[PDB]
Amino acid sequence: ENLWVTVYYGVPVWKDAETTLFCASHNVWATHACVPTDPNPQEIHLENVTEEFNMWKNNMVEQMHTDIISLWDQSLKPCVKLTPLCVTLQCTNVTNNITDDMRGELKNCSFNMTTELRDKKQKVYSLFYRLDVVQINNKEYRLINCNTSAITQACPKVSFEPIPIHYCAPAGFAILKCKDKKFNGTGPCPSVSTVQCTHGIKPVVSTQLLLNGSLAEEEVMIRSENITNNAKNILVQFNTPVQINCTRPNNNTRKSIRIGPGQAFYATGDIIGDIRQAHCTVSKATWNETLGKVVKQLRKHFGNNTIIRFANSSGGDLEVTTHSFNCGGEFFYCNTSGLFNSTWISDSITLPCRIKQIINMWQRIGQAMYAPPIQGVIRCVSNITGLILTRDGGSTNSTTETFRPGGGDMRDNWRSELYKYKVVKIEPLGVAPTRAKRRV
Amino acid sequence: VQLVESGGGVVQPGKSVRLSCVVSDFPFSKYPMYWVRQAPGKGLEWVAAISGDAWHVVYSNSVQGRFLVSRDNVKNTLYLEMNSLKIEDTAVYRCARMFQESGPPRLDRWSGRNYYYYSGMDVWGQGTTVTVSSA
Amino acid sequence: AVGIGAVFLGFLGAAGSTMGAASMTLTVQARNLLSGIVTVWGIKQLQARVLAVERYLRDQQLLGIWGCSGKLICTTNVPWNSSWSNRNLSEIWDNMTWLQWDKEISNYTQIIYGLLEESQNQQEKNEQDLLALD
Amino acid sequence: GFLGAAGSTMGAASMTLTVQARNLLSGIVQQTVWGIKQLQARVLAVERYLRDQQLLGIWGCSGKLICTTNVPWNSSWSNRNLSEIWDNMTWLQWDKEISNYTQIIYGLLEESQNQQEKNEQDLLALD
Amino acid sequence: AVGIGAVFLGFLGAAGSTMGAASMTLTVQARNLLSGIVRAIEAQQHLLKLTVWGIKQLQARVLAVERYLRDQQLLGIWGCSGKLICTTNVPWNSSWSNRNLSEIWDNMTWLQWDKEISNYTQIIYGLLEESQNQQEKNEQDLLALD
Amino acid sequence: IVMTQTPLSLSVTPGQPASISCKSSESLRQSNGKTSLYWYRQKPGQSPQLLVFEVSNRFSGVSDRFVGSGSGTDFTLRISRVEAEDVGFYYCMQSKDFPLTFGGGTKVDLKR
Ligand SMILES: *[C@@H]1O[C@H](CO[C@@H]2O[C@@H](C)[C@@H](O)[C@@H](O)[C@@H]2O)[C@@H](O[C@@H]2O[C@H](CO)[C@@H](O[C@@H]3O[C@H](CO[C@H]4O[C@H](CO)[C@@H](O)[C@H](O)[C@@H]4O[C@@H]4O[C@H](CO)[C@@H](O)[C@H](O)[C@H]4NC(C)=O)[C@@H](O)[C@H](O[C@H]4O[C@H](CO)[C@@H](O[C@@H]5O[C@H](CO)[C@@H](O)[C@H](O)[C@H]5NC(C)=O)[C@H](O)[C@@H]4O[C@@H]4O[C@H](CO)[C@@H](O[C@@H]5O[C@H](CO)[C@H](O)[C@H](O)[C@H]5O)[C@H](O)[C@H]4NC(C)=O)[C@@H]3O)[C@H](O)[C@H]2NC(C)=O)[C@H](O)[C@H]1NC(C)=O
Ligand SMILES: *[C@@H]1O[C@H](CO[C@@H]2O[C@@H](C)[C@@H](O)[C@@H](O)[C@@H]2O)[C@@H](O[C@@H]2O[C@H](CO)[C@@H](O[C@@H]3O[C@H](CO[C@H]4O[C@H](CO[C@@H]5O[C@H](CO)[C@@H](O[C@@H]6O[C@H](CO)[C@H](O)[C@H](O)[C@H]6O)[C@H](O)[C@H]5NC(C)=O)[C@@H](O)[C@H](O)[C@@H]4O[C@@H]4O[C@H](CO)[C@@H](O[C@@H]5O[C@H](CO)[C@H](O)[C@H](O)[C@H]5O)[C@H](O)[C@H]4NC(C)=O)[C@@H](O)[C@H](O[C@H]4O[C@H](CO)[C@@H](O)[C@H](O)[C@@H]4O)[C@@H]3O)[C@H](O)[C@H]2NC(C)=O)[C@H](O)[C@H]1NC(C)=O
Ligand SMILES: *[C@@H]1O[C@H](CO)[C@@H](O[C@@H]2O[C@H](CO)[C@@H](O[C@@H]3O[C@H](CO[C@H]4O[C@H](CO)[C@@H](O)[C@H](O)[C@@H]4O)[C@@H](O)[C@H](O[C@H]4O[C@H](CO)[C@@H](O)[C@H](O)[C@@H]4O[C@H]4O[C@H](CO)[C@@H](O)[C@H](O)[C@@H]4O)[C@@H]3O)[C@H](O)[C@H]2NC(C)=O)[C@H](O)[C@H]1NC(C)=O
Ligand SMILES: *[C@@H]1O[C@H](CO)[C@@H](O[C@@H]2O[C@H](CO)[C@@H](O[C@@H]3O[C@H](CO)[C@@H](O)[C@H](O)[C@@H]3O)[C@H](O)[C@H]2NC(C)=O)[C@H](O)[C@H]1NC(C)=O
Ligand SMILES: *[C@@H]1O[C@H](CO)[C@@H](O[C@@H]2O[C@H](CO)[C@@H](O)[C@H](O)[C@H]2NC(C)=O)[C@H](O)[C@H]1NC(C)=O
Ligand SMILES: *[C@@H]1O[C@H](CO)[C@@H](O[C@@H]2O[C@H](CO)[C@@H](O)[C@H](O)[C@H]2NC(C)=O)[C@H](O)[C@H]1NC(C)=O
Ligand SMILES: *[C@@H]1O[C@H](CO)[C@@H](O[C@@H]2O[C@H](CO)[C@@H](O)[C@H](O)[C@H]2NC(C)=O)[C@H](O)[C@H]1NC(C)=O
Ligand SMILES: *[C@@H]1O[C@H](CO)[C@@H](O[C@@H]2O[C@H](CO)[C@@H](O)[C@H](O)[C@H]2NC(C)=O)[C@H](O)[C@H]1NC(C)=O
Ligand SMILES: *[C@@H]1O[C@H](CO)[C@@H](O[C@@H]2O[C@H](CO)[C@@H](O)[C@H](O)[C@H]2NC(C)=O)[C@H](O)[C@H]1NC(C)=O
Ligand SMILES: *[C@@H]1O[C@H](CO)[C@@H](O)[C@H](O)[C@H]1NC(C)=O
Ligand SMILES: *[C@@H]1O[C@H](CO)[C@@H](O)[C@H](O)[C@H]1NC(C)=O
Ligand SMILES: *[C@@H]1O[C@H](CO)[C@@H](O)[C@H](O)[C@H]1NC(C)=O
Ligand SMILES: *[C@@H]1O[C@H](CO)[C@@H](O)[C@H](O)[C@H]1NC(C)=O
Ligand SMILES: *[C@@H]1O[C@H](CO)[C@@H](O)[C@H](O)[C@H]1NC(C)=O
Ligand SMILES: *[C@@H]1O[C@H](CO)[C@@H](O)[C@H](O)[C@H]1NC(C)=O
Ligand SMILES: *[C@@H]1O[C@H](CO)[C@@H](O)[C@H](O)[C@H]1NC(C)=O
Ligand SMILES: *[C@@H]1O[C@H](CO)[C@@H](O)[C@H](O)[C@H]1NC(C)=O
Ligand SMILES: *[C@@H]1O[C@H](CO)[C@@H](O)[C@H](O)[C@H]1NC(C)=O
Ligand SMILES: *[C@@H]1O[C@H](CO)[C@@H](O)[C@H](O)[C@H]1NC(C)=O
């Protein structure tokens, strides 16, 4: 058994680690200049590979979250601080040629404010939403954030239209990808291929549905962490997308008022004609067929003859109640109690929406942004790919399953696209015995 | 420059022919060639295209399973074959040339995979037409 | 407006093959260790490039201290100790991939490194200067 | 000299490249806003030198500066006769005559390096 | 419940020893030019992007890499790359000392020898570079007659 | 990948500028750094002749009335000094991906 050892080099050995990403390819989503490249990263398919994956463990989601918060902070630096706004507001109601359902929203208020001269004042009046002003004690009301953190403005030269982003890996490392189209979030995958960069990812923000997202390969699938638990959000991924119109029928104006040395402010002008109500409109029967396919997959894991039902929202905060989205560079909050009203045993739909101006953040009370009122008429068409579901408990003899909306944090939204990828550290070195021997 | 499109005729369905296309006045080993198609009273249609060094070939969405094209660099002569014909395949068949001079292939050092590069055309010849008929 | 003309092996294509056969594609990995370039973003670019430099220099130093530097695979004079595995020479080379062998021996690494360093120093260099004089 | 063999024929500047080689065996020897640039400059220098040393070290040519190998030269890349090259052409002209086939030449050298030199060496080691 | 056991040479294990015997721990001594912390540093490697402090860590790492490159490159200029030791062809100048070898190799240590010979430095570097140049390529060009 | 002509056809008169569009269905920014839109015209009973390549770059040996325009969203054309020799069919052509596609048809004539 005269045996000696070889020392090989460049053997294909995997490990696991956490590392730093790598971007690829006036707006402040990406850059004007991220990395120029040969933008066709060729997929490389393997042989005889079975690899364990995992979900709800992704470092990449956390890196994406930190990077997007960092870029969003990078945006709001050079703009204008809005400190002289916390004043008293003498107000009056809006009357002229108004639809009676829109009574209460708009308010005509006026106040005093300084100009670029530090020695005089002026008289400034504009138009505000109901959901942004709060009563102090005619209608002497104060601004909704003046009890708390200060208020800023966004610079008007920057749009909010998202652009796809390709992540890539640094050298010495690699990314893998599951070719099995029937992969629930955890467990092994039997068909693995590698890429040097990923597909395009649109960082799109919404609460309850999913917009402009990816499809599924085959059918409707259902993703959650612990389905035996009732304290887990459930991911929905459709097979066929559904169109949606959402638009602002009103027709907008905007003034521009100097407030300080090198500082100006954007106030709202007047509106031609009527005062209407923004809303959304979808199909009807495709919704019914979609929920039929959903409950077909739902009976595969719960009691099939257990009653499958939908509830409304269970209340709580205004944020997770409505449906946030960003059509036209503006933020719409939609009263969506209509779509979740059905029971199940074993063409146009109207949904009114509301708009805010002072916009919190992901989950921070340290900032406040005031978007300028966009002049004109805004229309938006988008797709719908996914949904977010919750579930109660109390297993009282397996009856009456009722579901509700959800969708708190955006990390679930960024696992919705990133449910496949995994990062691998490469070990080139390695040894093995042999029958040879070094010679003098 | 000299470029002819020979080969008119008329046939019933179920035949097999051979087509020719004579070139001159360019260094033939460098260029790619196409095959376009013009229906009577209609617009244009792309069919097939051979590589520069005569090793790569693509077809249209229709005849994948019918045709065959080959290049003779020695005689500077194109040979096309169209088999198992249909009467509704009657159109104008032309033998035209890409404008831009392509070059050598590229070999990436990432899983090899030699790549080629194409672009559109500049020169069309006169043309020819074979009407696949019945009687 | 492209075509595909594949000739050579894939990057890590041979990973699902057997060790004695997949030993012949070792070039491609070291061919593809230090490329990919072929505000905050440039910061993490330089971060990544520095990390790649550090790992490559670490492994070349580990090559250089041994007497198996510069070239590819080589030999030594350390006889095998059977306290680590006890196969009969066919089950490894014909019946085992690389991830399997890596999970088999991932506790004995540092001892093998140290003993190769020991035999590389001892009786090789002082012995050389013994041979460099009558 | 530092790049002294510029306006010469390849066959003409074929003997005194060793003095060039010793003179090109230097660069780090004989030693805020701007410091960021200095850091990036050092990074670029390190990356280029390591690129060159890697590409030397993969082949069998990583000792001396000229060497031989086991690849027959294919006539598809060029077609010029030998004296025509060595007595009637500079380096830049040869560069523009070869700068499309370079990667294939690299890959052929790599495969010639791996095959029939190490596993063949491994079979030669067994007595 | 942690118990310790068998031993090895170790880091700096022969700095107070006889040079002829201490000449054999060069491996473990020379391993740690690029390490010494061979441990979850990667998280602070990641998130220190918006400060001067990770910039200074970057300074430190790049400087250490350059020092290793300076040493290995200067050895690479001589024809002794990829080795631990090498003999050469410069005859020793006996002006520099006339001690017998039996005192240096038996009753002298390294820092003593450092404090002894610390002025003859660049002369030795130049002579080694000369013999690695003169007839190491010139007569090697004359040895290239095949 | 599909592509449409915009508008269909038009009868024109001399002493007038011209502009003919061709709406894309994608954006074809090549990795070489441009977009693959070519124009070429034919005449009845005759062969086509190349109009303009490189989006905005007149072909060799062509009068100065012919240039190109547009980016990956949609494209146009630019012809001044309408002359009776400038009649026939004008086609826009994709040369990015297989299979290729073509412009439909632009009937161009005088006015009676
Ligand atoms: C290598 O590779 C490369 C590439 O690759 C690269 O790199 C690598 C690395 C990788 O990466 C890849 O990827 C890349 O890509 C190559 O390159 C190549 O080259 C070539 C050359 O050979 C070329 O080709 C050319 O092309 C042209 C066009 O294009 C150009 O232009 C444009 C504008 O200007 C631009 O854009 C472009 O770019 C180009 O440019 C250029 O580019 C380049 C590149 O980079 C650079 O470098 C430069 O610099 C530039 N320049 C400038 C100035 O800009 C075309 O056009 C051409 O064609 C033409 O020409 C030819 C020559 O001359 C001709 O032929 C002729 O013909 C005649 C007849 O008779 C005869 O006589 C003679 O003999 C001949 N010759 C010969 C030689 O053959 C042809 O034909 C043409 O001509 C023309 O034709 C026409 C027809 O039509 C005509 O027209 C006419 O006219 C008349 C009067 O006028 C009437 O009007 C009629 O109607 C019409 O039609 C005309 O006339 C003519 N002309 C005259 C003058 O006459 C050429 O071909 C290409 O391009 C390239 N590529 C690319 C991609 O680009 C290379 O090669 C390789 N290799 C090495 C070694 O290096
Ligand atoms: C030096 O150098 C040179 C050069 O190189 C080059 O360059 C460089 C720069 C680079 O780039 C590289 O890469 C290159 O290569 C060299 O040369 C070379 O060599 C080699 C060898 O040596 C070669 O290889 C070869 O290959 C071949 C190919 O083949 C193809 O084809 C075939 C068929 O054939 C055909 O047939 C037909 C019937 O007859 C015909 O037709 C006809 O024709 C006539 C005349 O022409 C007349 O016209 C009549 O009329 C008609 O009908 C034709 O023509 C022909 N063609 C030809 C071309 O020939 C087949 O079978 C095969 O398979 C192939 O195929 C192909 O494939 C490809 C690939 O796959 C394909 O592609 C495709 O595509 C699609 C679309 O996209 C997709 O992509 C897919 O995926 C793909 O796949 C195509 O399509 C096809 N085509 C056809 C047509 O088919 C082969 O074959 C061969 O093999 C052979 O032999 C063997 C022996 O063992 C046997 O086994 C087999 O079986 C066979 O037989 C070989 O492999 C190459 O090629 C060359 N190149 C060139 C360019 O050419 C040299 O070598 C150097 N030197 C040294 C010393 O080395
Ligand atoms: C899911 O994904 C879909 C697909 O992208 C996405 O839909 C797209 O949404 C965007 C956002 O609204 C739409 O883009 C806008 O389109 C309007 C309409 O103009 C187009 O159509 C007219 C038709 O007559 C054409 O004439 C015109 O040229 C356009 O092609 C534009 O008006 C918008 O442009 C304004 O915003 C830009 C960004 O700031 C400005 O750069 C631009 O100049 C315009 O702003 C100007 O407004 C004032 C008027 O000129 C001026 O005074 C200002 O100073 C300022 O300059 C914008 O391009 C796009 O059409 C949608 N696409 C489809 C297919 O529906 C969804 O939005 C997405 N989902 C979510 C939630 O985002
Ligand atoms: C818009 O949001 C409301 C908020 O819950 C949805 O519920 C509707 O709320 C109104 C109150 O403005 C209800 O009208 C009356 O409410 C009182 C107290 O809530 C009660 O006595 C009765 O419910 C009475 O009808 C209305 O009924 C209620 N409707 C439902 C279905 O809950 C409303 O549905 C949302 N609309 C849309 C289109 O999303
Ligand atoms: C804006 O400035 C005016 C100017 O002083 C202030 O309103 C005055 O209030 C005092 C005290 O009640 C009265 O005596 C004056 O007659 C008011 N003048 C006017 C023009 O209203 C106050 O600081 C601000 N008023 C409002 C409505 O914002
Ligand atoms: C700052 O003031 C606002 C009111 O302007 C406070 O909002 C209160 O919100 C609760 C709901 O949680 C209501 O029940 C109260 O009626 C609101 N207050 C008033 C005066 O209407 C807000 O909580 C205050 N925050 C802090 C930190 O003081
Ligand atoms: C309502 O919308 C129309 C068009 O969408 C606006 O009409 C513009 O009006 C200005 C001045 O009144 C003109 O200079 C433009 O040429 C008009 N554009 C068009 C397309 O007709 C109108 O101003 C809008 N009204 C409000 C209050 O926003
Ligand atoms: C979701 O729907 C339910 C039921 O339609 C709404 O519940 C209302 O709750 C209040 C207070 O508990 C009752 O006074 C109302 O009578 C209920 N409505 C009805 C029609 O009975 C709930 O408000 C809806 N939530 C949202 C956000 O739309
Ligand atoms: C050893 O080094 C000494 C000092 O560098 C050399 O002494 C010099 O010798 C030359 C002639 O050999 C004289 O011209 C110099 O004046 C001497 N230097 C001094 C400071 O006086 C000595 O030659 C060297 N020995 C060998 C063998 O190289
Ligand atoms: C997907 O869900 C099923 C049912 O809950 C369960 O097996 C597991 O969570 C996932 N599947 C696999 C194979 O791991
Ligand atoms: C999570 O899953 C386990 C195993 O199915 C189950 O016992 C437990 O009740 C679940 N729910 C939790 C921990 O809330
Ligand atoms: C949305 O509105 C536009 C304009 O009326 C229309 O073309 C489109 O079909 C609408 N979509 C739906 C789903 O109603
Ligand atoms: C429910 O019923 C369907 C058919 O009625 C059957 O295929 C399925 O196995 C049943 N599932 C359960 C959980 O009872
Ligand atoms: C909600 O459902 C109830 C019964 O299921 C029905 O009476 C009511 O009209 C529904 N409301 C909407 C908005 O669909
Ligand atoms: C290895 O040797 C043992 C005894 O020496 C024998 O029993 C066994 O079958 C052998 N296995 C192989 C794979 O040769
Ligand atoms: C060799 O070169 C001469 C000129 O130096 C040329 O005439 C001859 O054709 C060449 N022959 C070959 C075989 O390349
Ligand atoms: C000095 O070190 C040597 C070996 O390192 C040892 O033998 C000797 O005892 C030490 N000296 C003293 C005084 O301990
Ligand atoms: C070296 O040893 C010889 C032999 O005994 C002696 O003559 C000489 O003086 C010694 N020199 C020194 C420096 O010890
Ligand atoms: C060193 O040790 C040797 C032998 O013990 C002795 O002869 C010599 O004098 C010592 N050196 C000194 C400086 O004492």
Numbering used by the authors:
A (entry chain A): 32 to 56, 66 to 143, 152 to 185, 188 to 309, 312 to 323, 323A, 324 to 397, 412 to 505
B (entry chain M): 2 to 52, 52A, 53 to 82, 82A, 82B, 82C, 83 to 100, 100A, ...
C (entry chain B): 512 to 549, 569 to 664
D (entry chain F): 521 to 551, 569 to 664
E (entry chain D): 512 to 549, 557 to 664
F (entry chain N): 2 to 27, 27A, 27B, 27C, 27D, 27E, 28 to 108
Sentences from the paper on this structure:
All HIV Env trimers were stabilized and purified using the bnAb PGT151, followed by size exclusive chromatography, to ensure isolation of well-formed functional, cleaved Env trimers. To make direct comparisons, we evaluated the membrane-bound ΔCT form with and without a glycosite present at amino acid 332. Processing at only a single glycosite, N411, appeared to be impacted by the presence or absence of glycans at Asn 332, which rendered N411 glycoforms predominantly oligomannose-type in N332 Env, but complex-type in T332 Env. With the EM reconstructions of recombinant membrane-bound Env trimers for the three HIV strains in hand, we mapped site-specific glycan processing on the surface of corresponding cryo-EM density maps. Comparison of the reconstructions with color-coded glycans suggests that the highly similar architectures of these trimers leads to similar processing of the glycans on the three strains except at glycosites N160, N276, N339, N386, and N392. At the trimer apex, the glycan N160 consisted predominantly of high mannose glycans on BG505 ΔCT T332 and B41 ΔCT, and in contrast, exclusively complex type structures were found at this glycosite on JR-FL ΔCT. In addition to the apex glycans N156 and topologically proximal N185h/187 glycan found in all three strains, B41 and BG505 contain an additional glycan (N185e/N186e) near the glycan N160, which could effectively shield it from the glycan processing machinery. Furthermore, lack of a glycan at position N197 is likely to induce more open conformations at the apex of JR-FL ΔCT relative to BG505 ΔCT T332, facilitating the processing of the N160 glycan. Significant differences in glycosylation were also found at glycosite N276 that resides adjacent to the CD4-binding site, ranging from predominantly or partially under-processed oligomannose in B41 and BG505 ΔCT to exclusively processed complex type structures in JR-FL ΔCT. Since JR-FL is the only strain that lacks the N234 glycan site, we suggest that the corresponding glycan may restrict the glycan processing machinery at N276, resulting in under processed glycans in B41 and BG505.
All bnAbs to date target the envelope glycoprotein (Env), which has become the primary target for design of a protective vaccine. A major barrier to HIV Env-based vaccine design is the glycan shield, comprising 26–30 N-linked glycans that cover the protein, thus blocking recognition by the immune system. A major advance towards engineering an HIV Env-based vaccine was the development of stabilized soluble trimers. HIV Env trimers from three HIV strains, JR-FL (subtype B), BG505 N332 (subtype A), and B41 (subtype B), were produced as recombinant soluble SOSIP.664 (SOSIP) trimers, membrane-bound ∆Ct trimers, pseudovirus and/or infectious virus.
